[PDB]
Design a protein around this ligand. Structure first.
Ligand SMILES: CC(C)(O)c1ccc2cc(C(=O)N3CCCc4cnc(N)c(F)c4C3)[nH]c2c1
Ligand SMILES: O=P([O-])(O)O
Ligand SMILES: [Ca+2]
Ligand SMILES: [Ca+2]
Ligand SMILES: [Ca+2]
Ligand SMILES: [Zn+2]
Ligand SMILES: [Zn+2]
Length: 232
């Protein structure tokens, strides 16, 4: 029961819009930050807390920031070897273990066709991409928010926590039918970040930050070109 205005202030802060408005001398009213968000999400650029902007802010999405408050990390944020390993550290009880394993394998198979990298499952803490399910504060100081709102987050390529992918288990994980969010579609978006991709402004793109259920092929031209500009 946040008000529409309280939701707007929280959204603009969480995803980096308020910090950018501060750097431009324009954080004492909502309008300038709203214009930065409408440009970034490809909404009409009104500067108002209008119906299209409120509908966007209420839409479940990725927990990675858009414009600001990104942490300082080690290295140039791409992988420098070909065989990327992953470890499924724990399981949601919402799906059978073999269905969770296959959702992650399918999400990696989407990227493998369009990148010179391979993805291989291991059972070891020193995998490149460690996958975890967690609730609220889950060990990295970037807490989840309970049911709906942000669904998951991931870290850009590098050592340790870098490249890792976390899924909010206060969500109901499914394949996106009946109830719950598609673990396949969320994992596919989060693995893009774990390969070094940013958010897209193209609403149809996999790397757009909002969750959109589809039964169609998830990759768009903007996603494939994004990976091409990283690894060839
Ligand atoms: C586009 C690029 C540069 O490859 C890239 C891609 C994805 C990420 C994810 C982060 C990152 O900063 N975090 C990892 C995601 C969790 C998180 C959430 N809120 C923050 N304010 C925050 F700093 C972090 C830390 N930083 C990133 C940077
Ligand atoms: O905010 P509205 O007037 O576009 O509904
Ligand atoms: Ca890692
Ligand atoms: Ca959540
Ligand atoms: Ca759950
Ligand atoms: Zn994202
Ligand atoms: Zn986390």
């Amino acid at each position: 029961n946040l008000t529409d205005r309280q939701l707007a202030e929280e959204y603009l802060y969480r995803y980096g819009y308020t910090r950018v408005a501060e750097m431009r001398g324009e954080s004492k009213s909502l309008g300038p930050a709203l214009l930065l968000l409408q440009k970034q999400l490809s909404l009409p650029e009104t500067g108002e807390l209008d119906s299209a902007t409120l509908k966007a802010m209420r839409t479940p999405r990725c927990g990675v920031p858009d414009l600001g408050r990104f942490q300082t990390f080690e290295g140039d944020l791409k992988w420098h070897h070909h065989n990327i390993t992953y470890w499924i550290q724990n399981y949601s009880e919402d799906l059978p273990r073999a269905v969770i394993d296959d959702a992650f394998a399918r999400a990696f198979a989407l990227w493998s066709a369009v990148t010179p990298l391979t993805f291989t499952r291991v059972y070891s803490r020193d995998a490149d991409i460690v996958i975890q399910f967690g609730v609220a504060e889950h060990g990295d100081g970037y807490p989840f928010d309970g049911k709906d709102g942000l669904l998951a987050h991931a870290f850009p390529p590098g050592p340790g926590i870098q490249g890792d992918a976390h899924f909010d288990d206060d969500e109901l994980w499914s394949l996106g039918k009946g109830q719950g969010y598609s673990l396949f579609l969320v994992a596919a978006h989060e693995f893009g970040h774990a390969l070094g991709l940013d958010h897209s402004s193209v609403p149809e793109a996999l790397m757009y930050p909002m969750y959109r259920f589809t039964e169609g092929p998830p990759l768009h031209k903007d996603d494939v070109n994004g990976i091409r500009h990283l690894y060839g």
